[PDB]
Design a binder for this molecule. Structure first.
Ligand SMILES: CSC[C@H]1CN(Cc2c[nH]c3c(N)ncnc23)C[C@@H]1O
Ligand SMILES: CSC[C@H]1CN(Cc2c[nH]c3c(N)ncnc23)C[C@@H]1O
Lengths: 229, 228
């Protein structure tokens, strides 16, 4: 069977999986811990990267280049931009951009550097698998664009600008970087986020209130996807 | 030992490929990685493409896939310290990500849990650079570099980042590369030659001086390879 990596950013996003698995082997590498487990006869490597683009890029690269993961599922929470999203709602990214990658001084569009794309796509077959799981389990699942950058967004004006430029439905600090790594290394990637907040005024309070539960929702979903891989 | 030499742009690495003359290349991770022998060292070289994610990926690939045991970063930067002139060399003692921001939760700018604000480079490589600078009569300054995913060309932003971090220069790849190297237990050296002063019209100075400043930095890191 295919070797699966499951990646989140924070302990809250991955600990629910570790608790469900119960039995696993911990390996210290890249100033972090990587967890190795067998789930319903699937070989898994799991980790939380620590927050942000650099940490999540490094973890995705380690999971693939060092440990040989063949498919990568990202699980965690996000800030909702689309007004139809509520706290706890699941969104998978069809494509992702880095909103804070800015060499626009040279005439490039926001989010662009030479040699790369503005938007990185996720894997079609994995996205269709997620739609099958959502139907099976009667779980509401939305498709959308995720905007990634190294700021916790809690500002209606910033939210509005990023939504306008990229038609983004949510924001977070790891998806586009993870997707870029997977695309570069020819590994199918799936990015799932459960909303923890609405990325506006007082979003830090909502994040703290809802991160634990929203993280569990996304974590459970990706574990169910593993069963179809 | 196996040595990685990494830049962000073609201009930062092509001067080394011209000097080395003979090299092989492998296509991997949506990039090209170059391989050559130099003074009893296998070198692996690349330009990452611009910014934090691209440079993180290349550093990780060079170490995890191609087995680099030391990494030298070479390229250009925007000067913040008023004593720096275009063309001057600066090596980083430590670096921060000025645009890594979870300050809503009370943390300082540049901090996320599990990491520190500043990431250090390797003391022994830095001391080797001082020896090379002494030997070659090259002026070399030590300082703090602030890294982020924006080209800085605004006097107010320059001043803010300089004040918060006491940064001597800015760029878009150093802190990320240094973090990867530190995490993977690989000694890292970050060298930059100034291409601009990161204020008004910095985009025009950058275009004018990138080629020459890139050559200055490149030459220096190759001289370091002789003493390793
Ligand atoms: C403690 S920093 C937030 C952590 C959880 N992440 C996802 C996220 C939820 N709400 C967000 C928002 N308003 N702005 C940016 N990111 C997010 C990213 C980071 O790992
Ligand atoms: C075409 S984008 C600029 C490329 C060269 N870089 C170093 C650099 C020089 N001057 C800088 C400045 N004012 N602001 C940020 N970065 C730099 C980073 C990027 O690879």
């Amino acid at each position: 069977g295919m070797k699966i990596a499951i990646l989140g950013a924070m302990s809250e996003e991955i600990t629910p999986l570790l608790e469900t698995l119960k039995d696993y082997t911990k390996i210290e590498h890249a100033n972090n811990t990587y967890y190795f487990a067998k789930y319903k006869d699937h070989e898994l490597v799991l980790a939380y990267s620590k927050i942000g683009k650099v940490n999540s890029t490094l973890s995705a690269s380690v999971m693939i280049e060092k440990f040989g993961a063949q498919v990568l599922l990202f699980t965690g929470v996000a800030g909702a931009f689309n007004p139809e999203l509520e706290i706890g709602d699941l969104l998978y990214a069809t494509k992702l951009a880095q909103y804070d990658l800015d060499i626009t001084a040279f005439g490039h569009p926001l989010g662009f550097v030479p040699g790369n794309e503005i938007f990185i796509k996720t894997d079609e077959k994995l996205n269709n698998l997620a739609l099958e799981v959502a139907k099976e389990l009667n779980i509401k699942l939305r498709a959308g664009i995720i905007a990634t950058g190294d700021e916790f967004i809690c500002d209606e004006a910033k939210k509005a600008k990023i939504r306008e430029i990229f038609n983004a439905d949510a924001c977070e600090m790891e998806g586009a970087s993870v997707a870029l790594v997977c695309d570069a290394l020819k590994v199918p990637c799936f990015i799932l986020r459960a909303m923890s907040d609405k990325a506006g005024e007082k979003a830090e309070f909502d994040f703290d209130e809802f991160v634990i539960n929203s993280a569990k929702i996304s974590a459970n979903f990706v574990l169910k996807m593993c069963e179809k891989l």
